[PDB]
Symmetry: D2
Subunit: 179 residues, 4 copies
């Protein structure tokens, strides 16, 4: 019924590069929704709140907090397996860099995962990801912004305009984050 | 016990981007050798050809080696994947597999033997894995791009080793 | 005397790449204002309206139509000359791209100064004692955006929503 | 009679990125030769010897030392004017980054330089260049290598394999260069 694009990350904090990549994959892979799935380290409520603010304006974007759950999964196989059990009627896709598995030799563990859920490999306009694997590709325009660059900019008091949503910036300032 | 970097790929043909990445991983990760491992499709460029071009591409580098374990996974009743057969043959060595991290900012914990990520210098990557990276200078060259060049008669200089180009020519490969 | 960054362009349409580059030059080179200067040769009117919308939210950005007033019917000034003519005491900084090649030639015999823009980490050598602004890469252009509008592809996160809104209701870009 | 591509740089030292770019332009702009023109110091002996070594393998690559001459030109207009005078029957082209002039407003001093000689703008595959100016364009695969990175690698004792020609590395190490 629904084509869901699983989009993982730290989103510490979420930024324009995240929104851009998600929208491009959404359109290019003909998906219905993109689920922003924040990972967890064994703070979080701040990441959850900045994410909600970042995605608000895009009806096609959702927040998936399965990894935040008590005794929740963290390994992709487990996380994807649970989501498949919760949404058996939907078609799930997993987003990765198109080059993540380019240099790997034949590996059953990888194949098991690739057969569990349809992988979408993100790459820059043009460019070829050789190595044969079941993969849907999505060309996304390069936008060199990262959560780490953003954090240091806040710390060093450098501008963040056009790199992060205004609402995210406002939330960061009000909560004394990345000081 | 040696530190070995495993480099999978089709290598049709092998190019300077392959050589560069392998060498950077080799020194930045403090490894002893890099093993180039040509893959093969189930009959669905010929392998002996890709293997020959590889030998030529890595000749000049002593730390580079050709390994054909993916070409010998088939047993009379059981078939190993490349990773398991390698561990079988070299149980005492430290095998490092290479993971790309040049397109996305985050790397998922998709795997439950070590890994080395390769990204462009300056490119920030976050991941739950305590992973060591190798900052490889960007080199927008691929086998696909190279094949198109041979076919369309465009230059290949500085993109592929001269000996590999010579092989392609002496064997009429790539239209 | 202000420190003014001159930002030439076709801006049809203006996009987030333009705003980001301007903001970075503005701050990194410690300037007071950045002047977006549409070249003349989409009709000027629309490009001018889209530009106002694009820069509105940023106080340090200004629209300057001097390149559109270079004709005084007997003599035509080039933009640089009319600017010095109008603001002789201000410090005018022109922006030079240096993100494709390693070297920047001494092509100009140099009130007028230059600022180079390149990706962070990209090393540039030049005989010029030039200040560079490290602008994060953003692979977006006007041409690319026009094509997306024409083929009904997304433009979200690439251009300001107000610019997109203006394009749609004015039936611009087919 | 000859279509020449003027390729300026510090070439301190020359590396594979230079050779690649030059070959691509040559082919893409249908040129006959590419002239590597070392810029005047705002020593040179070593840069010149490495350049000779770097281009030896390509018959289409030539060395142009006009900026090295006593009382020689250093500004593009001056340099090009002298070269056009020395080679009146050939068609010269000047190589620059395609974005060099992308952000400049109408300027006659630039127009004058562009009419003096045909400019070629190098850029990455795809990605457009707005630029209300002549310019012939040449798409060149991105090869993230520069003379700065190389020098730092020699200093830090990092590998330079596949980044610079063997003969160049040989020259650097024989003359103990860049280990500052």
């Amino acid at each position: 019924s629904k084509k869901i694009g699983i989009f993982g990350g730290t989103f510490d904090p979420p930024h324009n590069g995240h929104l851009l990549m998600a929208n491009e994959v959404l359109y290019q892979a003909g998906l219905d929704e993109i689920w922003f799935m924040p990972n967890q380290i064994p703070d979080s409520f701040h990441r959850v709140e900045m994410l909600k603010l970042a995605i608000q304006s895009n009806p096609s974007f959702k927040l998936e907090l399965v990894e935040m759950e008590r005794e929740g999964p963290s390994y992709t196989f487990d996380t994807v397996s649970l989501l498949k059990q919760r949404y058996p009627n939907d078609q799930l896709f997993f987003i990765i860099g198109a080059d993540m598995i380019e240099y790997l030799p034949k590996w059953y563990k990888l194949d098991e995962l690739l057969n569990l859920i349809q992988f979408i490999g993100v790459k820059r306009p043009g460019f070829h990801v050789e190595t044969p694997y079941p993969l849907l590709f999505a060309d996304v325009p390069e936008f060199e912004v990262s959560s780490t660059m953003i954090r240091e900019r806040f710390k060093s008091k450098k501008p963040t305009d056009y790199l992060i949503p205004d609402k995210v910036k406002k939330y960061v300032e009000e909560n004394g984050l990345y000081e």
